[PDB]
Ligand binder design. Structure first.
Ligand code: ADP
Ligand code: ADP
Ligand code: ADP
Ligand code: MG
Ligand code: MG
Ligand code: MG
Ligand code: MG
Lengths: 336, 536, 546, 520
């Protein structure tokens, strides 16, 4: 139980040592030991802490026997380097993709995790996620392409790989015209949809009552001309950045998009564009003039399924098929 | 909780409970804190420690029994080690610092076995069986020195004396201390060389002078001087004499009065005049009974009135006043006299006999002390110690006291061993050899007991600035090549690791108790699970 | 328990860390402290409880969903059942009382299993292997929704949910209201899949009369007050047009942050007159369209009120956004956020107006509500509850809310199971012979899992102030003989449960007590995950706040 | 840990049932002296300092702060009777408090489960409504002489019984004015206006159809007496309107600033010309009026009233028939008030009062009550609302039931015959309602100074003879029938009193635990 009230139940020894505040100066160094184990290999953070404490216990009796500490430290480094070559002869190389070696090693690495009983369908899940990215140079295999989305409610048995990009945030639903979209082109809007304003302070002076009649019509005409170019490219799905500085949506804009049955989802993270652009195969559109059909991708089904109070927006299939794909997995569970 | 206060025992929140591995770790570390303190003072290269009392008095000693006695502790496990060294000093009186190091060494090897999943009783069962195998092995190696005559028997007493005198302050005079400690037992002892009485030897310290002034005086040393000091200080016997005819009296000099409260009613002047003559007739009668008996120095427990100051001065009879009751028992033993309860029972056969009675000036003022000497071998030997510091005069008492505890243990027949770490190494390899034959679950129990015995020789190498690894490996390789057990650690570095050439000798009864007190105490500590400590 | 442990010896932590069996002992006491509440509220013989906020207000809540929500529990493991009771409302909507008692009993009996030194992984596996066979056994013993010629189901489905509630004696009257309310609000999606939008039925709070006289409204009832008193209170005639607008009818400032600068003073008045004239342009298109009722999300300025009275139009202001969406679909109107189309011109089309039979505003006990009945496009329903006070209707509001979720599960999945301890008792005999096959250390874990489910049927008899043994001992006689009943219907021995009123064992099918099958699957899986997470906690670490 | 921070300790079992029954009985025990024509009065002290002295049941309960949570549910029961009907609030608590008092020796003694009792309370509630329906007789709702005796039912207890002959004429014409044909009369208290004017005499009063305003005239020349008044309601203030856009004018030429003030005077004159198009005699607005718009209306003889209450404008539109229009451009002759007459401002030292007299069926009336003091005048206001509430249920349904102890005992006799025929576990809780209906007729005797032992003993013997009209006199305590004296009360009052008591008893018997400390 943390100081702010958050309670974390973790099997991993890194989170156990990180969330726990130790008053002893040297005992906190074990927290960063599991950090190096989790950053490089990612597995064995609990064992490396036990091995560190075991070597200190073996070296504790060596201090009273008249051995200098540097001799003890230089002896462990010489023994650790020799222990590396011991494991190099015993290990066996494996094929690029093998369902027998990868699945059995993934379920074994789970060990005491709560998912060990759920490891039946979860072991092929982690294997098939990495197999989508293959290289002969043995790159670190960045995990940014693998997105694990957490949803409150349900059971872990319902966890399965999604065939396409999943959206964490829900639809605007203010207009809520389209219920479900089939064979839609998902768009990406990096700009703001609103009545025309500069990004800096401006002034509008009205010297005649007839001028206000043109203002209300032209403010809606700007939002109308944006919907015209979208309809010509047959883009039924739009995604807009948060845009805390300038309003991203408007009641007049959502009404124009409701007539064309265009689904729009806002409040999207800025760092998630790389997952949206590579996963859906859609080039972001930052300008109404740069908007075209070539930058738009293809999606079979874009829908929002409300199940047991948990609302989620999922996309099924990507027809782009660019160089490398992405992995999308939705996580469900009873307790947060 | 259901919403109501749940209290099983009074002072709920005051008392705490310890259980599991955390309860065992706190007990081992409590002994390691006591061990590392005692390990520094172990061996002749050790160092003393200052003991500050709550009243302001200070004490400087390396003795594990004295350090822990005045030590104020909190944890009860460290308090159990206090009575461990107290058990060693009360009975044997030697090896108080070795029982603490050996006991904590058993607990250090037991903590490693507990982490491996061994039940604590299985650990205690292995130490009990390994303790009897080490004692039976060393008992066969030692030899009986009782075949030697009284001339060589004195040499063995000088050997074990110089060893116990080391490691303590004022160790430069140990050559003369070893000679004076043996002569006390030579004078006071049974004719069969058995069951010598230790209570006949008294330890009397004196603050002043230098340590070179310490010498043996057979007799009684009292803090009281001669009453009415118009008499000569040094009393000399008559030309011909059987002795000085020392007199001891527990009755003060007074006219006879009933023990019960009495009322003497004088109804006339004639009855009052008879009391005047009756008064002086008793003081004249009491001084004549001593002169007719031939006695010279008169000792009174309660003293006497100033009337007898000049009365005993006319007859040249020395007298002392306000002598303690415990000192009166010490006087009759030295002079072989008998305490006379009253003048009617006073006879010449009950008078004591000593060589000379005299007093010393000591320092400038200080106080006047009486000294008695004997003309032949007697049953009383009083130790006389001097020093330039109050701390030196104090520690030298228990330094020679522990030296006398080693000699009286040698009075017991057919127990001798050689010290210097040679005993622990011999008993260590005998236990490790049985571990290979037994195997089983107890195989690791004999290993922990063998590694604990080697801690004492390795501790001796730490205070001497040596390599505990190279020293222990040499001792173990020597016992495997040859059967001689006399090779041990040398902290004085005179060479010749053989203990026979270095003369170092220790009592076997002292070394046997070190294993028994350490093994049997760890058996109780390992059984402790729930620790309930109330708040002060 | 006993004496507190020492504080961080050689451990050097700023908080409190306790290890050993003291954590699992306090974890059981955390679930047992919150269970003793939910326990006495289980079953038709259960009794309501009253929670006080110390501010003078009291809350009567029978089920443990809101009870655990209101009660503040700072214990880390105690918050699991608090979130579990709040969870059970999300998936099934009913069973918050049974899921907490079962999950607390799974941990209670497992406290003696760890004293055996049995590792939790053996305990967890014993509960999971027994659960996999339990879910399959429930699917074998389910009954079809066909039954006799007539329905004779949905009426009995609601009577089970009405139990344990104050309206349980009136369940015969409320049975027909819940069934007719859900069938009217049904929708269609996923190309033929029927959906049931729970909460679409409006629950109104009224005082006076009695709960037995509560009338089911054949349509939607909007809770709000009339804009102006000069408007007609009742609108009759067929084809009543209703306008739902999300746009502000009040006069608003020009743009947002601009500034109006006027040079010629002759235009000072003409510019201001246009600001008030643009607002009434949208009202003129509504009056010419023939809209009888104008529903507006936000308020209505006095400029728009004079046009509604002269045209005999009922204006309504301060409408909830979620309320108007249900009015649009029911009446057939289209929600209008603003007046515009693809063309540059601005006009109002008559297709955006809905149709219904009648619009009337009813006022009972200070509660004013507009009754919209006879929706042609899509039917709707509303329930007006009548009781002692508002807090007496607060329990009646959640009583009918749980009944809507139970009927939804029976229509989607026609598989139902009888209530009264039928499922909990049947799983015991099935798992007794199954544990003997596996054996080893998992035989005791499965045996304790079957005995842990006995807390539900035993709680029924304890809260009824009757003898529990004679009811449970006779209960097992039918279930123990049901597994050995053997093929040949003459089988019987199954679907029997406790009758708490008469103190006898009768068939639950003829008694009219049924429960959805999916309610048993989601309850046992959710109650196990709460026990698995607790059995896996060796050490609790509490860090003091900074 | 402490686990639950809210009432970790719990009180459950019979201890929670006794605390719920004892506190519920204490609510009814204080109002026992408030029942009957001889009933006393109760004074209440609020933290604000206002003193409320009345015998009404609801007015006593809502102004008392009860720390007992379950007893607070008893406080809201009178609100159910007051909002739905308004008469019979005292008998609800006395009946509901007696039920739990009679139902107490069951869970403790007979060990009967509450739900078993609830099933008996619901069956006894259905049979009680049938007995009340049988003893009820229909009467003519259009008879003015018959409705005067029905209003005296609630007046006999109140202090206004001395003026009852005058008070019935005030409440009769008030309900008949606001009612209209449409759910039948659909009369509402919001259309009836009761104005409290300190001083005067209670014997002298009249029902005035119109709106009585305390605002004075805005100009001295304004005529305070008009033969044929014409009322035009305007929500827009006559002051110069300012745009909310915060328009800032940049003045350059010297004639621009002088023109702005002139245009402000031209529009105010223009708005007056739009009003003078229909030539109204009176002007009434709910906002302030500028001093410039006053002069332009002096030529047309338009009397202006400013800062009129918002709800009063809706009551002016009912009597005068005018239509409320915010803009002056939409004013038409049809929107001008018609048929109104007798406009006069009477001079009183305290405040200026304006009178209106009427000649689309919804109307309004303003009752002027003149008391001896402000606090007594607050009592007549409460007594007048309860008097008009009796005439509501008479016009809603023709059914009329006896009162004064006849209806309560008529149900208890029918419950005694069916109880012996049940022969089951529900027989004991079914007899609790029969003894619970006896508290109301027993209280009438205790407050009258008679002997309840001998009167109630012979009272039950009369109901066995086949007549349900035997009541209990409030003065002499005679057993004479209520047909002779004429006590009759609407059946709705008797039904709402029994229904609320049964629904409330089932709520408190289901509470097995009381916990606090939640702090939501
Ligand atoms: N001069 C010495 N030469 C070799 N060993 C010695 C000498 N003095 C002491 N020792 C060893 O040191 C150990 C501890 O002796 P010491 O500290 O003097 O008294 P204690 O035995 O009471 O601790 C003994 O077991 C003895 O074998
Ligand atoms: N009429 C009845 N007879 C016997 N048992 C019933 C009856 N109604 C409900 N039960 C039992 O009471 C339990 C709880 O039912 P219910 O009150 O609907 O859920 P909850 O207690 O979660 O609100 C169910 O498991 C059911 O078996
Ligand atoms: N003169 C009377 N004789 C007999 N009964 C009376 C008399 N006056 C009033 N009552 C009864 O006393 C009751 C008191 O009525 P009231 O105080 O107005 O409200 P509540 O009935 O709530 O107390 C009435 O129901 C009426 O039947
Ligand atoms: Mg792992
Ligand atoms: Mg010694
Ligand atoms: Mg339920
Ligand atoms: Mg009344």
């Amino acid at each position: 139980k943390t100081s702010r009230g958050e309670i974390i139940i973790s099997n991993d020894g890194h989170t156990i040592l990180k969330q726990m505040a130790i008053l002893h100066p040297v005992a906190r160094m074990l927290v960063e030991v599991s950090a190096a184990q989790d950053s490089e290999a990612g597995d064995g953070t609990t064992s490396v802490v036990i091995l560190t404490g075991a070597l200190l216990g073996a070296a504790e009796r060596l201090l009273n026997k008249g051995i200098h500490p540097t001799i003890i430290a230089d002896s462990f480094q010489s023994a650790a380097k020799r222990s590396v070559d011991i494991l190099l002869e015993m290990c066996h190389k494996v094929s690029l993709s093998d369902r027998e070696q990868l699945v059995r090693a993934a379920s074994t690495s789970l060990s005491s995790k709560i998912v060990s009983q759920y490891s039946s369908f979860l072991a092929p899940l982690a294997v098939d996620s990495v197999l989508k990215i293959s290289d002969e140079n043995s790159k670190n295999v960045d995990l940014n392409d693998i997105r694990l989305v957490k949803k409150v409610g349900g059971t872990i048995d319902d966890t399965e790989m999604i065939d396409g990009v999943v959206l964490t945030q829900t639809a605007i639903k203010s207009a809520g015209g389209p219920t479900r979209k089939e064979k839609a082109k998902i768009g990406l809007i990096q700009f703001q949809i609103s009545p025309p304003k500069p990004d800096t302070e401006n002034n509008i002076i009205v010297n005649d009552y007839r001028q206000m009649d043109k203002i209300l019509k032209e403010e809606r005409a700007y939002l109308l001309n944006i919907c015209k170019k979208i309809k010509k490219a047959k883009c039924n799905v739009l995604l807009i950045q948060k845009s805390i500085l300038r309003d991203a949506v408007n009641d007049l804009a959502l009404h124009f998009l409701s007539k064309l049955n265009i689904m729009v989802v806002k409040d999207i993270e800025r760092e998630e564009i790389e997952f949206l652009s590579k996963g859906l195969g859609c080039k972001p559109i930052a300008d109404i003039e740069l908007f075209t059909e070539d930058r738009l991708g293809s999606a079979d089904l874009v829908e929002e399924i409300d199940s047991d109070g948990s609302k989620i927006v999922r996309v099924t299939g990507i027809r782009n098929n660019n160089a490398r794909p992405t992995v999308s997995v939705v996580i469900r569970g009873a307790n947060n | 909780e259901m919403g109501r206060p749940f209290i099983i025992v009074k002072d709920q929140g005051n008392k705490k409970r310890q259980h599991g591995l955390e309860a065992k770790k706190s007990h081992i570390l409590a002994a390691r804190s006591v061990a590392s303190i005692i390990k520094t003072s172990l061996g002749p290269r050790g160092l003393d420690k200052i003991l500050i009392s709550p009243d302001g008095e200070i004490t400087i000693t390396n003795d594990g029994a004295t350090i822990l006695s005045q030590m104020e502790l909190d944890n009860e496990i460290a308090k159990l080690l206090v009575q461990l060294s107290k058990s060693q000093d009360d009975e044997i009186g030697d090896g108080t610092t070795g029982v603490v190091v050996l006991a904590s060494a058993l607990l250090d090897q037991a903590l490693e076995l507990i982490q491996k999943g061994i039940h604590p009783i299985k650990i205690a069962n292995g130490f009990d069986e390994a303790a009897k195998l080490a004692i039976s092995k060393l008992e066969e190696t030692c030899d009986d020195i009782s075949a030697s005559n009284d001339e060589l028997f004195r040499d063995f007493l000088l050997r074990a004396a110089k060893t116990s005198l080391g490691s303590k302050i004022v160790s430069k005079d140990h050559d003369r201390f070893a000679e004076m400690a043996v002569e006390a037992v030579i004078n006071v002892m049974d004719k069969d060389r058995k069951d010598v009485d230790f209570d006949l030897i008294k330890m009397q310290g004196r603050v002043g002078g230098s340590i070179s002034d310490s010498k043996l005086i057979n007799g009684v040393i009292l803090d009281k001087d001669f009453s009415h000091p118009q008499m000569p200080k040094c009393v000399l016997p008559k030309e011909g004499s059987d002795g000085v005819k020392l007199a001891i009296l527990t009755c003060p000099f007074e006219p006879p009065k009933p023990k019960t409260k009495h009322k003497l009613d004088i109804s006339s002047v004639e009855e009052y005049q008879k009391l005047q003559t009756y008064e002086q007739d008793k003081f004249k009668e009491m001084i004549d009974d001593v002169k007719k008996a031939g006695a010279d120095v008169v000792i009174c427990q309660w003293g006497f009135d100033d009337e007898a100051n000049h009365l005993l001065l006319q007859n040249d009879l020395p007298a002392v006043r306000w002598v303690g009751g415990q000192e009166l028992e010490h006087i009759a033993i030295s002079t072989n006299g008998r305490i006379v309860p009253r003048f009617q029972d006073l006879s010449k056969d009950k008078l004591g006999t000593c060589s000379r009675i005299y007093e010393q000036e000591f320092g400038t003022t200080k106080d006047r002390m009486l000294i008695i000497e004997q003309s032949k071998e007697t049953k009383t030997v009083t130790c006389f110690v001097r020093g330039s510091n109050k701390m030196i005069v104090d520690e030298a008492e228990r330094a020679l006291h522990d030296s006398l505890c080693v000699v009286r243990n040698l009075v017991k027949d057919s127990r001798v061993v050689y010290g210097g770490g040679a005993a622990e190494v011999t008993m260590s390899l005998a236990v490790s050899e049985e571990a290979d034959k037994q195997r089983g679950i107890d195989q690791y129990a004999f290993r922990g007991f063998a590694q604990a015995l080697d801690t004492i020789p390795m501790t001796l190498a730490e205070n001497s600035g040596l390599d505990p690894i190279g020293t222990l490996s040499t001792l173990k390789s020597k016992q495997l090549k040859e059967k001689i057990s006399n090779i041990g650690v040398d902290c004085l570095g005179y060479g010749s690791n053989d203990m026979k050439e270095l003369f170092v000798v220790d009592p076997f009864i002292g070394k046997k108790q070190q294993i028994l007190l350490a093994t049997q105490l760890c058996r109780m500590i390992l059984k402790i699970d729930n620790v309930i400590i109330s708040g002060k | 328990q006993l004496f507190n442990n020492s504080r961080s010896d050689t451990l050097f932590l700023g908080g409190e860390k306790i290890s050993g069996d003291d954590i699992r002992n306090q974890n059981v006491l955390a679930t047992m402290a919150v269970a003793n509440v939910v326990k006495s509220s289980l079953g038709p013989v259960g009794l309501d409880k009253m929670l006080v906020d110390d501010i003078g207000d009291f809350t009567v809540t029978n089920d443990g969903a809101t009870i655990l929500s209101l009660l503040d529990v700072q214990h880390p493991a105690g918050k699991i059942l608090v979130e579990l009771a709040q969870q059970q409302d999300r998936e099934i909507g009913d069973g918050t009382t049974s899921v907490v008692i079962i999950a607390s009993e799974l941990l209670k009996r497992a406290n003696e299993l760890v004293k055996n030194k049995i590792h939790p992984t053996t305990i967890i596996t014993g509960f999971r292997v027994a659960l996999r066979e339990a879910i399959r056994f429930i699917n074998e013993v389910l009954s079809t929704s066909v039954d006799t010629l007539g329905k004779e189901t949905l009426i009995n489905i609601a009577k089970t949910s009405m139990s344990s509630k104050i309206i349980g004696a009136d369940s015969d009257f409320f049975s027909n209201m819940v069934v007719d309310a859900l069938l009217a609000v049904k929708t269609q999606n996923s190309k033929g899949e029927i959906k049931y939008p729970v909460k679409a039925v409006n629950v109104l709070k009224a005082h006076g009369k009695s709960a037995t006289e509560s009338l089911l409204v054949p349509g939607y009832a909007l809770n709000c007050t009339v804009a102006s008193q000069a408007m007609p209170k009742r609108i009759a005639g067929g084809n009543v047009k209703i306008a739902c607008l999300d746009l502000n009818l009040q006069k608003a400032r020009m743009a947002m942050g601009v500034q109006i600068n006027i040079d010629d003073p002759e235009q000072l008045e003409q510019i201001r007159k246009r600001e008030a004239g643009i607002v009434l342009e949208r009202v003129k298109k509504i009056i010419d369209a023939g809209a009888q009722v104008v529903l507006t999300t936000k308020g209505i300025d006095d400029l728009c009120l004079k046009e509604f009275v002269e045209a005999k139009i009922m204006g309504v202001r301060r409408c909830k956004k979620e309320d108007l969406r249900r009015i649009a679909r029911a009446t057939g109107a289209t929600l209008v956020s603003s007046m515009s189309n693809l063309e540059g011109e601005e006009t109002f089309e008559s297709s955006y107006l809905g149709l219904c039979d009648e619009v009337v505003q009813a006022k009972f006990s200070d509660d004013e509500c507009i009754l919209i009945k006879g929706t042609s496009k899509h039917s709707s329903s509303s329930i007006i509850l009548r009781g002692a006070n508002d807090y007496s209707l607060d329990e009646m509001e959640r009583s009918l809310h749980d009944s809507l979720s139970v009927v939804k599960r029976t229509l989607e999945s026609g598989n139902v199971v009888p209530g009264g301890g039928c499922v909990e008792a049947a799983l015991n005999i099935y798992l007794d012979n199954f544990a003997t096959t596996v054996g080893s250390r998992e035989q005791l874990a499965i045996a304790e899992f079957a005995a842990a489910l006995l807390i539900i049927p035993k709680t029924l008899a304890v809260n009824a102030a009757k003898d529990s043994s004679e009811l449970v001992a006779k209960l097992r006689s039918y279930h123990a003989a049901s597994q050995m009943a053997k093929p040949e219907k003459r089988r019987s021995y199954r679907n029997y449960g406790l009758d708490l009123i008469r103190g006898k064992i009768v068939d639950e099918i003829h008694a009219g007590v049924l429960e959805p099958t999916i309610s048993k699957v989601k309850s046992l899986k959710s109650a196990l995950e709460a026990c698995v997470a607790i059995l896996r906690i060796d050490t609790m670490i509490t860090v003091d706040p900074e | 840990v402490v686990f639950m921070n809210a009432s970790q300790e719990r009180t459950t079992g019979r201890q929670a049932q006794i605390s719920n029954i004892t506190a519920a009985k204490a609510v009814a025990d204080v109002i026992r002296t408030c029942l009957g024509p001889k009933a006393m009065l109760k004074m209440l002290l609020d933290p604000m300092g206002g003193l409320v002295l009345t015998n009404d049941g609801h007015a006593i309960l809502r102004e008392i702060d009860v720390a007992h949570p379950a007893a607070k549910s008893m406080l809201e029961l009178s609100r159910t009777q007051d909002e739905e009907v308004g008469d019979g609030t005292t008998t609800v608590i006395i009946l509901a408090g007696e039920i739990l008092a009679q139902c107490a020796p069951y869970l403790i003694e007979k060990n009967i489960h509450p739900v078993i009792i609830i099933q008996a309370l619901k069956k006894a509630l259905t049979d009680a409504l049938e007995v009340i329906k049988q003893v009820s007789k229909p009467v003519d709702v259009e008879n003015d002489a018959a409705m005067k005796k029905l209003i005296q039912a609630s007046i006999g207890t109140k202090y206004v019984i001395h003026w009852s002959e005058k008070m019935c004429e005030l409440a009769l014409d008030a309900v008949k004015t606001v009612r209209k044909d449409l759910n039948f009369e659909i009369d509402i208290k919001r259309y009836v206006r009761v104005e409290k004017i300190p001083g005067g005499d209670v014997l002298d009063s009249r029902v005035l159809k119109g709106v009585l305003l305390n605002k004075d005239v805005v100009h001295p020349k304004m005529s305070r007496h008009i033969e044929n008044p014409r009322v035009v309601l305007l929500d827009c203030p006559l002051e110069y309107k300012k745009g909310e856009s915060q328009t800032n004018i940049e003045i350059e030429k010297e004639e621009d600033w002088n023109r702005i003030l002139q245009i402000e005077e031209e529009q105010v004159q223009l708005m007056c010309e739009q009003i003078l198009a229909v030539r109204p005699t009176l002007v009434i607005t709910e906002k302030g009026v500028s001093d410039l718009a006053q002069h332009y209306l002096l030529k047309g003889g338009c009397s202006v009233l400013r800062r009129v209450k918002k709800s009063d404008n809706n009551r002016i539109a009912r009597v005068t028939g005018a239509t409320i229009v915010n803009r002056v451009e939409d004013l038409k002759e049809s929107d001008v008030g018609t048929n109104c007459g007798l406009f006069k401002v009477e001079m009183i030292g305290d405040e200026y009062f304006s009178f209106l007299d009427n000649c689309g069926l919804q109307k309004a009336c303003t009752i002027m009550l003149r008391g001896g003091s402000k606090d007594i005048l607050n009592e007549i206001d409460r007594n007048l609302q309860d008097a008009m509430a009796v005439a509501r249920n008479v016009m809603l349904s023709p059914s009329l039931s006896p009162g004064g102890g006849a209806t309560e005992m008529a149900v208890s006799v029918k419950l005694a015959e069916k109880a012996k025929q049940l022969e089951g576990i529900q027989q004991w809780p079914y007899q609790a309602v029969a003894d619970a209906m006896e508290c109301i007729p027993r209280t009438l005797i205790q407050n009258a100074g008679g002997d309840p032992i001998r009167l109630l003993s012979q009272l039950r013997a009369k109901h066995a003879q086949g007549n349900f009209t035997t009541g209990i006199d409030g003065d002499k305590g005679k057993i004479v029938d209520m047909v002779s004296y004429g006590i009759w009360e609407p059946e709705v009052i008797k039904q709402q009193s029994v229904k609320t008591a049964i629904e409330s008893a089932c709520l408190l018997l289901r509470v097995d635990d009381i916990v606090s400390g939640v702090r939501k």
